[PDB]
Amino acid sequence: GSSGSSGDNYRTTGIATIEVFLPPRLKKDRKNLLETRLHITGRELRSKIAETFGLQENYIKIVINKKQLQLGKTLEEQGVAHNVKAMVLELKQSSGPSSG
C-alpha cells in the first residue's frame, strides 16, 4: 500500500559489509557479502538475509562472535561494524501448539 519515504542527495552512507555464510545445502557462490546499514534493527537483518537470498527469516538465526544476533538490539547496539562475519543457522523442529 503505497511506497516511498525518506530521501537523500549528499551524505556519508552508513553502509556496512556483512559476510553471510550459508550452510552446505544451498550453495550459491563464494562468501556472500551483504551491504546494509547499522541503524537497522538486528531483526531487519534476520529478515534481510532471508529476503536477500529468498531464504526464510522465521526459520533462521544469525550468529556473531559465537553469540546470537540481538534482534532486540541494533547492528550497532549489538556490536556490528564494517567487514564483519555472520553465520546462518536453521531453527529446530518447531511443534508448539497443535494446528487446527
Architecture overview:
The protein is an alpha+beta fold. The chain has 2 helices and 5 strands. 15% of the residues lie in helices and 25% in strands. A 5-stranded mixed β-sheet has the order 2-1-5-3-4, covered by helices on one side. Strand 3 (61-64) and strand 4 form a beta hairpin. The termini are far apart.
Q: In sequence order, what are the helices and strands, one letter per element?
A: EEHEEHE
Percent helix:
10-25%
- Supply the CATH architecture: Roll
Distance between the termini: 31 Å
CATH class: Alpha Beta
Total of DSSP H or I helical runs spanning 4+ residues? 2
DSSP, total strands? 5
Spatial extent as radius of gyration? 15 Å
Strand content: 25-35%
Strand order in space, largest sheet: 2-1-5-3-4
Shape: globular
Number of domains: 1
| CATH topology descriptor | Ubiquitin-like (UB roll)
Helix-and-strand structural type: alpha+beta
CATH fourth-tier homologous superfamily: Phosphatidylinositol 3-kinase Catalytic Subunit, Chain A, domain 1
Major sheet attributes: 5 strands, mixed
PDB class: protein binding
Keywords: structural genomics, RIKEN Structural Genomics/Proteomics Initiative, protein binding
Assembly: monomeric
Entry title: Solution structure of N-terminal ubiquitin-like domain of human NEDD8 ultimate buster-1
